[PDB]
Amino acid sequence: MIVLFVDFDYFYAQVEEVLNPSLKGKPVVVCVFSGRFEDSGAVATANYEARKFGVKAGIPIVEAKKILPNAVYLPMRKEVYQQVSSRIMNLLREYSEKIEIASIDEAYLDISDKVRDYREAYNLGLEIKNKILEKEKITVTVGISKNKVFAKIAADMAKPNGIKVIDDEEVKRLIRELDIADVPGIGNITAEKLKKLGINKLVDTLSIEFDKLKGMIGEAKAKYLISLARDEYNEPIRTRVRKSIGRIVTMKRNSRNLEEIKPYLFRAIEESYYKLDKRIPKAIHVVAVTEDLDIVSRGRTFPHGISKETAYSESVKLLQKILEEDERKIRRIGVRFSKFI
DNA sequence: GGGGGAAGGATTT
């Protein structure tokens, strides 16, 4: 199999640069203003200019403005970035019917029936980079390898504006030298658990007793890494079918007053049904971020579809189930629909 | 013992 993976460079920030090229070159910071007080919220992402000084996705907008007080701060415009993404994702389809849109700025292409070797594939990668740069003025990074995992790892090594190929040869090398924490699907918690087991490279999973590995990181993960270590991993590229859709919103101020939260909750539901579009959910979940940032959710499933009206009533029931089973004040509140028909 | 499915916390991104 030959898989070409595409990841848009500092997407949100870049899109802003595209709609305002004067920004090009200066440090740009896209933020999510939570409005609980002037400049509350976080940095969704920043371009490399700003990234260069520690301003990056995740940090508080306040911290940011301290390091780069004179950087361009813009509010996140998801809808806009969503539409650009959509235009680019379509250009990608021109190159393969077998495409797997993984995220708003990531796509997997199975180009097995398009090229014969990595040289051809590499070229196709450049063709694609030029197409997107031309059509949308957006730079991306291309990762190419035998499976999705390595195609992604490739992109990771090459971004920004790069392109890399990991041949069957280097794959083998990487299975022995790559820091296992850098493997897709392995976050801090798993990486940590692995370190404790003397497993720092993929290959290490082959020399450890399975059941001991399973008991630590779980059967799914254990199998996943082992298949990678055995150079046997090779899941097919598949159309992504959104299994759940929801919206979560931060409140002006903490609270556990059902009447003070409802607005946020309903708002979340509305934004959700709009996103649902045609999709009818049978399950619903309410999620709340408590004041100490712990997360609590309560849901319910129905034997039939759910009308928006139902969602409203039912979501309030769940909100209360939360409010009564947890004494902490709520900070952020959301709803999540799933099990579509 | 385990299929099957529901629920809630865990983990990744």
Next chain:
DNA sequence: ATAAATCCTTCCCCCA
């Protein structure tokens, strides 16, 4: 101190 989704593990009914 943003936000969106999927992934494990647990509990529970019950097997014709």
